[PDB]
Design a protein around this ligand. Structure first.
Ligand SMILES: [Ca+2]
Ligand SMILES: [Ca+2]
Ligand SMILES: [Ca+2]
Ligand code: NA
Length: 481
């Protein structure tokens, strides 16, 4: 059975504390549509109750302690999360927890620290002398105390910050005696520093503590894997070691996917090599190709979809997706795949044999931001494609990318899955037909479009070929009737 991931959150969901209960209630629906794993948003205390979760104040507070003015996180309380995870596990759905370990935000107090300013354009270049600043670097977890962990954070557990409280100044500051970590992205010279207080992975105590927390987190929630946040800003060898550590300690496989944000496949292959392919990465280049096709009114050359993507070179180390919380409307990396094209993009990642596909909560249920271009709920257009993946997308694949608009592929089916096999056709322009091979063992079968876009079926000829049709700017997925 094909595995399918679902990112179970959108950036603009309401701060109502009902999310874990919602996830629990969606268990049956997710299972029915073939979702085998869910990536849940950061489950620990952020800078405030409404923090989406990337503020990462206290990794040991999973909506359990009264801190930052709330007990629950934006999503609910720890018990509610535990009940939801129990429900998902009862239906064989795996759970991946978000891991935000690049920085810590919302420090309890400031500390006096000697620092220098570095050039935002080249962080290796110092542009000031040393001076005393007041940095938000003291974390004592006043509500948790020593429960689960007695480790407290001070400025010397970090490399720098972007705020001097004494002067209300926003610059990039490197603390005395610290050096940006390596290896990290080399954008801006060294991209170790992103926001808040940047964790110093050169510090032995910090590395040991983040590993220890990783195990505690996996055990406390009984997680099945992880989604790693902002990895281009975190020492690569540490991420490699952290993933190995958590797997050895838990004895579980712990599927892991990292979000390395780069348009460039080169930067992505370097990261995979440096972490010795021990985990996957989201296929960011593929997302930009989807956005490009959807916005060029038919002018995009669809043959390009086979190249320049992570999945095209590392089929087993790529998590493919259409849109996510970084790319949805109103976000800093906004590059939403237009609605008319969305189902075509979904057909591409859900019915092809390579890559671990991910469905976006915002695409299924809509996004709740306040622009005039929010994503509409498209679950009704995606459900049939999920059905195609769950029941028909098996066996040998044949690709037909011989046209600038109309491209398609087939799956012959596999004898272990009854009636499996399919023929998919997509076009970013005018419709048309394409003769495709689906396997001689399917000779004589009547196949029809499971999406409902075309009503006439296709009969497979004696040599295993069928002539499939697709309407303009549309997708058709034929399966045995
Ligand atoms: Ca960093
Ligand atoms: Ca450092
Ligand atoms: Ca085209
Ligand atoms: Na650092």
């Amino acid at each position: 059975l094909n595995g399918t991931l679902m990112q179970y959150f959108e950036w603009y969901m309401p701060n109502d504390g009902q999310h874990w209960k919602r996830l629990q209630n969606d268990s049956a629906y997710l299972a029915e549509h073939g979702i085998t794993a869910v990536w849940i948003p950061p489950a620990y205390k952020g800078t405030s109750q409404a923090d989406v979760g990337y503020g990462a104040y206290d990794l040991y507070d999973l909506g359990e302690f009264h801190q930052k003015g709330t007990v629950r996180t934006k999503y609910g309380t720890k018990g509610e999360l535990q009940s939801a995870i129990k429900s998902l596990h009862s239906r064989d759905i795996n759970v991946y927890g978000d891991v935000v370990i690049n920085h810590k935000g919302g420090a309890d107090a400031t500390e006096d620290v000697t620092a220098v300013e570095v050039d935002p354009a080249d962080r290796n270049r110092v542009i000031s002398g040393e001076h005393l600043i007041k940095a938000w670097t003291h974390f004592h977890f006043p509500g948790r105390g020593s429960t689960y962990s007695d480790f407290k954070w001070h400025w010397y557990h970090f490399d720098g910050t972007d705020w001097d409280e004494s002067r209300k100044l926003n610059r990039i500051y490197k603390f005395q005696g610290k050096a940006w970590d390596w290896e990290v992205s080399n954008e801006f010279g060294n991209y170790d520093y992103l926001m808040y207080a940047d964790i110093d992975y050169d510090h032995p105590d910090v590395a040991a503590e983040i590993k220890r927390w990783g195990t505690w987190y996996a055990n406390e929630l009984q997680l099945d894997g992880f989604r790693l946040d902002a990895v281009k800003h975190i020492k690569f060898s540490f991420l490699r070691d952290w993933v190995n550590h958590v797997r050895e300690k838990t004895g579980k496989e712990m599927f892991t996917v990292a979000e390395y944000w780069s348009y460039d496949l080169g930067a992505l292959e370097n990261y995979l090599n440096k972490t010795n392919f021990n985990h996957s990465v989201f296929d960011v280049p593929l997302h930009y190709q989807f956005h490009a096709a959807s916005t060029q009114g038919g002018g995009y050359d669809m043959r390009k979809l086979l190249n320049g993507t992570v999945v095209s070179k590392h089929p087993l180390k790529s998590v493919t997706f259409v849109d996510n919380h970084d790319t949805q409307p109103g976000q800093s990396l906004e590059s939403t795949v237009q609605t008319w094209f969305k189902p075509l993009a979904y057909a591409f990642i859900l019915t092809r044999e390579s890559g671990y596909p991910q469905v976006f909560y915002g695409d299924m249920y809509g996004t709740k931001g306040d622009s005039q271009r929010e994503i509409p709920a498209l679950k009704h257009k995606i459900e049939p494609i999920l059905k195609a993946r769950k029941q028909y997308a098996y066996g040998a694949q044949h690709d037909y990318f011989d046209h600038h608009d109309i491209v398609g592929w087939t799956r012959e089916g596999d004898s272990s899955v009854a009636n499996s096999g399919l023929a998919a056709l997509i076009t970013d322009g005018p419709g048309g037909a394409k003769r495709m091979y689906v396997g001689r063992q399917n000779a004589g079968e009547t196949w029809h479009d499971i999406t409902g876009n075309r009503s006439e079926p296709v009969v497979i000829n004696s040599a295993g070929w069928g002539e499939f049709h697709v309407n303009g700017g549309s997708v058709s997925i034929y399966v045995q009737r």
